[PDB]
Amino acid sequence: EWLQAEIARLKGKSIVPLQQVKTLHDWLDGKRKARKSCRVVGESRTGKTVACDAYRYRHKPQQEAGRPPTVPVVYIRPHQKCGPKDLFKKITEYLKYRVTKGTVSDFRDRTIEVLKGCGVEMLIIDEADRLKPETFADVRDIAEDLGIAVVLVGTDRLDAVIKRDEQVLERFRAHLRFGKLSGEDFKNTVEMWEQMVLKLPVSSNLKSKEMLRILTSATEGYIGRLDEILREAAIRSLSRGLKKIDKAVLQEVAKEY
């Protein structure tokens, strides 16, 4: 049946090439050329993690015959309270090596060995605020012992962690902020989410200026609210046998907050 397959995509996640993502990708290209360590900051659900993943994918590992892969961009997200051993494990496993049993000293030396030769040139640490205060020293040592641009990604929660160590603060001072959208950029984004993401059976014409108040009141300009609303409404509409997102559905979803 048709409806269950639409639900199976609408409960999924997708990537939309917003201009915010483009702007980050030009910036990360400049940092990767300069090997410039830096940070990406901005409120929750602003699209940072999805923009970072899109950068990983477009700069995927290149295979070379019988060599370790060339992996220009390594993306990791630490587990909470990430120590040095946890950091080294995530980096080495990302490069498709297996960690052996060993000391932190073994893990460090093995990680530095494979950060070389795999030709890593950027390290993106998402949820960089999950790093333990002692493991930033190893992150800093990677940044300056190798020609690697380390990009710390977090919310303003990260800046509190950063400013608690002036050696971290002074290495990651350069920054880019993901902001909330508004106005015509929000209108174009809302238009994109109808006509590119949902691709629903019958249009709702989400350029409409009045219902844009309903979105704004729930969405506050968070993309990660906007993308949530429409999938909730569309699944309900297609569950209810409505070929469009009706106002009665959008406002009911937007009322759950």
């Binding site: 999924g12 996640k13 997708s14 990537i15 939309v16 090439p17 993943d53 899109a54 990983r56 994918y57």
Partner: peptide, 13 residues
């Protein structure tokens, strides 16, 4: 254009 995390897992992976 839009992409799926599951496609990207195969395509780039």
């Amino acid at each position: 254009e839009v992409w799926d995390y599951e496609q990207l897992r195969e395509e780039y992976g």
